Symmetry: C3
Subunit: 263 residues, 3 copies
């Protein structure tokens, strides 16, 4: 159902069954498939393809030549009716691609809210992007990658399948990420290695002096103490008893499957 207050350009092709919310705008030469839902106030500028079983939230801005919901590039995919979910107030720039999930990977590619996906960023099948993230130009996620809240990935950088980019991470440009990046960490290189705590990001986001200190101490446990990760996990959990921000490490360790990036 197309809301009576939505605008659908006469050259756009919105297939019967698509749901277009109030005050949405479907610009010229857009294609919107029959299983697409576009939330209130979302704008497709022009020349946008949205198809598949794809739900898009409110107040998104999707720029020309983006492809949202499309068949993924996993050779295992065979046409099953998988899904994309995109939240609210995202800015999805020219030529961005966001691909539907695979049955094998759980069936869902998900993007949260308030993200900035720059030109030609790629969100592969079964990726999970959180809130307030930035993918710079040509930042490329293989399948099943997690980009956690507030994480930022610099231009030309690619991430190997299943890797986790932890919350508040900053990955430099021109980098290649092959393992998991703990929350709060700066990473750079080919392959990417850790370069300390993203102190400036935490400062700007209202983390206290005490919390940043505890996070730096947890970083030192992981990377400077010389202990094994198995040894430091209970020490990090102990630290989190006083500084709850440190629990992000514990939660991340439980999800990590590829080991941590290391010097």
């Amino acid at each position: 159902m197309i809301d009576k207050s939505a605008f659908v350009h006469p050259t756009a092709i919105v297939e019967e069954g698509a749901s277009i919310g109030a005050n949405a705008h479907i610009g010229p030469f857009c294609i919107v498939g029959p299983h697409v839902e576009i939330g209130e106030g979302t704008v497709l500028k022009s020349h946008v393809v949205v198809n598949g079983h794809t739900k898009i939230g409110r107040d998104n801005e999707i720029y020309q030549f983006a492809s949202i919901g499309e068949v993924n590039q996993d050779l295992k995919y065979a046409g099953e009716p998988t899904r994309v979910e995109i939240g609210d107030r995202n800015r999805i720039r020219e030529s961005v691609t966001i691909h539907r999930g695979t049955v094998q990977g759980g069936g869902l590619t998900k993007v949260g809210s308030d993200n900035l996906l720059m030109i030609n960023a790629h969100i592969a099948h079964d990726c999970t992007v959180g809130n307030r993230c930035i993918l710079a130009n040509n930042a490329t996620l293989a399948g099943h990658v997690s980009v956690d809240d507030f994480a930022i990935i610099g231009g030309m950088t690619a991430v190997h399948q299943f890797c986790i980019i932890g919350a508040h991470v900053m990955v430099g440009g021109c980098s290649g990420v092959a393992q998991d990046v703990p929350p709060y960490v700066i990473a750079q290189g080919n392959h990417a290695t850790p370069f300390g705590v993203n102190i400036e990001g935490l400062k700007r986001r209202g983390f206290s002096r005490e919390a940043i200190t505890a996070i730096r101490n947890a970083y030192k446990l992981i990377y400077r103490s010389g202990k094994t990760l198995d040894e430091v996990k209970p020490e990090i959990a102990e630290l989190a008893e006083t500084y709850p921000e440190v629990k992000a490490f514990t939660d991340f360790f439980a999800r990590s499957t590829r080991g941590l990036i290391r010097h």
Copy 2:
């Protein structure tokens, strides 16, 4: 001539003289030039530009915002009527570009069959891509590059002009290839260097234990023996007398013009 069983969307622009085969599908807002031939069952999803003297085989899937047959980026090119040939059952993803040849380089850009060209892959003028290859996102070939059968090139990787990517090669992501890559070799880095035989690929493709052993021994001759390439060529040819798979090296050496990638 447009086959009576082809579908041409009313918004597509197929110029008189284009040949569109049985059960092909030309989606919305596609442009097809008058010297284009599109084979039986091939689909142009939407927003595809195909022009030049360009022949496309059967059962291809070409995704939105791809540009096939276009004027190449070689400053030497002056508008001569050069050609593109594309085979069968390729998957050519969003924003892929495949450019026509140059007179100077032989007049022909060629792609075989059963290839997967991921988002924004670039096939420059006078390139030759074989069968069953994979170019991952943003993989970029300069002019005159050969990508031989079954070779795979990882995301963000670029290849310098005239280089050969040998059969069954695996080039990692985030790499820059400046010299020729012998068949069966894993290559990675900036600039790319060899990292052994692509054993897993050969195993999956039905190579025998004996053949893989011979290929590993030829690899050692090239890279571990410490001899010159001129010395090892007859030794590799001798080995190929028993193990025909090793002849791939001989054939490659004869085409190689840039020297081999080396540690």
Copy 3:
């Protein structure tokens, strides 16, 4: 005003107020905003978006899926009416993006004449590109970058914000530029470092033997003498008293804000 000799395809959407010059060509499915000016003989092939306060010169060739004048990606930008200027005889290839300026950065993104911007090159807000430059595929400029006359940037290479790529520079592919590159210098790597004078480029462009020698001597002052930049500046200025080509260094030093790339 649309010149009576301009061609505007019936499927193109040229908003009232756009200025389209004599013998310009606006191809199918192009969108041209009301504050756009397109000069005599310029061609938009098809599927081109041009908007914003954007002035484009004569005899340009702009290929499909390019976005010229669009809202920039700087989170500081808030919709102010900033500008793009593009000169004459540029070749702007598929998927190139050129974004409008920011008030904070001066309000203007500028491109000169006779440039070749290859597939998916990115010109960010407030960049200044000169004349006769080449950006290869996926070459990506952050905001406020200067690319001076005749400079060339190889494929997959990105440039950090505010950096200057000096006149006649050659930056290799697969590189990441984080500081300023003096005129006449070859740069390569991640991060990019200097590799001597671009002798072949200067030779082809009519620089004299004496001028190239003086430029090589200025390069040695900067990078081989072991002196500080403050010491070498008057020595370079002294050299420029005889060889005016060396004044390019002086002019560059005055603009440089990020320090020079260094071994």
